[PDB]
């Protein structure tokens, strides 16, 4: 059959969570998206010859560390971890994601992406050497994105299937 792969896309507000979602999804550039919506889509892909079902959770809203919320999360196969490459602080909270992923799936292991979103701007804050040392030190990929270019849109989604796929074996 074909396989599903949950994904969920995480960061802080602002950095292009729902316009990273909505270019994959409708192969389009939103420049606005309600900030509160939270919501889940879906899109099969052909990813190294195989299509397999995508199942992307964009999430959104404040912290809530209910049982019920990690229950759910724990559902993600892979995370995205997006910061903005023109805003600091939405770097600095990288770190605070990628512990909660680790604890709520009770592993140093977790299919990870480091996205650095917003590539096509020239507001640049946050060094891409930076970046690419701060995905070192975690063991996972870096790819700079922009959801208005579709810059490394692809390459984001499916690096984090092909983590996945590894995992598994
Ligand atoms: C950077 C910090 C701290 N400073 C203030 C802003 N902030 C902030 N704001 C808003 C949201 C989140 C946040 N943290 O973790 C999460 C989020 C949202 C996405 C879901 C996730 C990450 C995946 C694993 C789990 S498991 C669980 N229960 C979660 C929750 N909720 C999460 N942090
Ligand atoms: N120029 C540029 N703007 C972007 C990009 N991604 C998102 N934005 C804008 O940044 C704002 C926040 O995007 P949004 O997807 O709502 O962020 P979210 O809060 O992480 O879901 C919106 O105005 C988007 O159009 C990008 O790659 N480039
Ligand atoms: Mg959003």
């Known amino acids: 059959g074909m396989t599903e792969y949950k994904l969920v896309v995480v960061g ?6 729902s316009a990273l979602t909505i270019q994959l999804i409708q192969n389009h550039f939103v420049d606005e998206y309600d900030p509160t919506i939270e919501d889940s889509y879906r899109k099969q892909v052909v990813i190294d010859g195989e299509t397999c079902l995508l199942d992307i959770l964009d999430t959104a809203g404040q912290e809530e ?3 019920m919320r990690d229950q759910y999360m724990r559902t993600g196969e892979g995370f995205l971890c997006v910061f903005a490459i023109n805003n600091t602080k939405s770097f600095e909270d990288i770190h605070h994601y990628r512990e909660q992923i680790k604890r709520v799936k009770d592993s140093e292991d977790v299919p990870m992406v480091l996205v650095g979103n917003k590539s096509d701007l020239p507001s640049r804050t946050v060094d891409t050497k930076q970046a690419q040392d701060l995905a070192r030190s975690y063991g996972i990929p870096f790819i700079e994105t922009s959801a208005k270019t579709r810059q490394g849109v692809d390459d984001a989604f499916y690096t984090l299937v092909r983590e996945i796929r590894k995992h598994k074996e």
């Open 65 to 67: 560390y209910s049982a």
């Open 12 to 17: 802080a507000g602002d950095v292009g969570k």
